[PDB]
Design a protein around this ligand. Structure first.
Ligand SMILES: *[C@@H]1O[C@H](CO)[C@@H](O[C@@H]2O[C@H](CO)[C@@H](O)[C@H](O)[C@H]2NC(C)=O)[C@H](O)[C@H]1NC(C)=O
Ligand SMILES: *[C@@H]1O[C@H](CO)[C@@H](O[C@@H]2O[C@H](CO)[C@@H](O)[C@H](O)[C@H]2NC(C)=O)[C@H](O)[C@H]1NC(C)=O
Ligand SMILES: *[C@@H]1O[C@H](CO)[C@@H](O[C@@H]2O[C@H](CO)[C@@H](O)[C@H](O)[C@H]2NC(C)=O)[C@H](O)[C@H]1NC(C)=O
Ligand SMILES: *[C@@H]1O[C@H](CO)[C@@H](O[C@@H]2O[C@H](CO)[C@@H](O)[C@H](O)[C@H]2NC(C)=O)[C@H](O)[C@H]1NC(C)=O
Ligand SMILES: *[C@@H]1O[C@H](CO)[C@@H](O)[C@H](O)[C@H]1NC(C)=O
Ligand SMILES: *[C@@H]1O[C@H](CO)[C@@H](O)[C@H](O)[C@H]1NC(C)=O
Lengths: 205, 49
């Protein structure tokens, strides 16, 4: 199924504070009024130039994401997972299960990382091997479509992982949306407190 | 004069009220001079007028 992106998906492009300034930025963004997928046993999805992901439910039915070329331990893959004590990220050669849920994999062959720490919005970029996650959590009064109005994703973590990614999947446990980035010129309205409060997708119309 | 992780210039370092988000390290002028800087050890924000 498909739906409107409704101008959701903007994020802070540069780690520079700017305020009360309209700034032109060229970057991978979700184009405005993009035609995003909505999923109502478990798909594997292409990564494209980059991913926008969101889900509306607080009950932690979602638990993570996995990314790579194979998702089968014949290469490395990224695992992002969340558990009752920690945020966890690692870059191991997991033998992932045909349905990955918390039991996400049978075995693992190498590793190079273990980082640790109601609509939930996420953006994943991979450039120069840095896999960059931005997110924000935002209130909603409806589930079957993305909410009206502007919302800037703050950078959450920024990891030098350097692995090749082309396919990905979402971990459940025992609805969500997906869109894909494209290179756009955007104009960002940084307000007095330096938050992006509006934007123009210059190639839209 | 200053060097801040390589950011080099001359300025009157002033305690900034600019509300940097925890990932941000520099702030910029329309000319791309650096308008404010995070101290690399105390992590406070300083204006560079
Ligand atoms: C990233 O991974 C993809 C596979 O998901 C690689 O694509 C393959 O590249 C080889 C040559 O190296 C071709 O023979 C295959 O036909 C390609 N497969 C597909 C499905 O296109 C890609 O080369 C990798 N890129 C990097 C930079 O490692
Ligand atoms: C969440 O995952 C982390 C691993 O990323 C688990 O942390 C480890 O816990 C064991 C004890 O069970 C410690 O000996 C390790 O030192 C921990 N590792 C790290 C990197 O912190 C954690 O136990 C998991 N929590 C749950 C509830 O499964
Ligand atoms: C961890 O990954 C490396 C590859 O990055 C594995 O190295 C290969 O091992 C096989 C034998 O199992 C050799 O035939 C290849 O020539 C090795 N490749 C390279 C590039 O050296 C390594 O074996 C993996 N670790 C484990 C325990 O399987
Ligand atoms: C910029 O930040 C200031 C706070 O530093 C915002 O003003 C506060 O807004 C909250 C409500 O969200 C009030 O409870 C406070 O009393 C306000 N403080 C002051 C001093 O007015 C201000 O609204 C922000 N600007 C924008 C455009 O969002
Ligand atoms: C959304 O895209 C799909 C194909 O990607 C198409 O079938 C559908 O008609 C599109 N919807 C709109 C409103 O353009
Ligand atoms: C760096 O120095 C500051 C004092 O200027 C100190 O508080 C801090 O703990 C030091 N960094 C680390 C990693 O210990």
């Amino acid at each position: 199924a498909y739906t409107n992106s409704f101008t959701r998906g903007v994020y802070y492009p540069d780690k520079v504070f700017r305020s009360s300034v309209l700034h032109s930025t060229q970057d991978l963004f979700l184009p405005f009024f993009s035609n995003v997928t909505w999923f109502h046993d478990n798909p594997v999805l292409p990564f494209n130039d980059g991913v926008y992901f969101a889900s509306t439910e607080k009950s932690n039915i979602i638990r993570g994401w996995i990314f790579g070329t194979t998702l089968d331990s014949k290469t490395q893959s990224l695992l992002i997972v969340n558990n009752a004590t920690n945020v966890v990220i690692k870059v191991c050669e997991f033998q992932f299960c045909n349905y990955p849920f918390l039991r996400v994999y049978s075995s693992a062959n190498n590793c190079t990382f273990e980082y640790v720490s109601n609509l939930s919005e996420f953006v994943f970029k991979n450039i120069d091997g840095y896999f960059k996650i931005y997110s924000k959590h935002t209130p909603i009064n409806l589930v079957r479509d993305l909410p009206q109005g502007f919302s800037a994703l703050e950078p959450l973590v920024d990891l030098p992982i350097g692995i090749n990614i082309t396919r990905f999947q979402t971990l459940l446990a025992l609805a969500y949306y997906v869109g894909y980035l494209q290179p756009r010129t955007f104009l960002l309205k940084y307000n007095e407190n330096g938050t992006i409060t509006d934007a123009v997708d210059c190639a839209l119309d | 004069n200053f060097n801040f992780n390589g950011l080099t210039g001359t300025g009157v370092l002033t305690e900034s009220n600019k509300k940097f988000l925890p990932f941000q390290q520099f702030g910029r002028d329309i000319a791309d001079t650096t308008d404010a800087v995070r101290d690399p050890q105390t992590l406070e924000i300083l204006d560079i007028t």
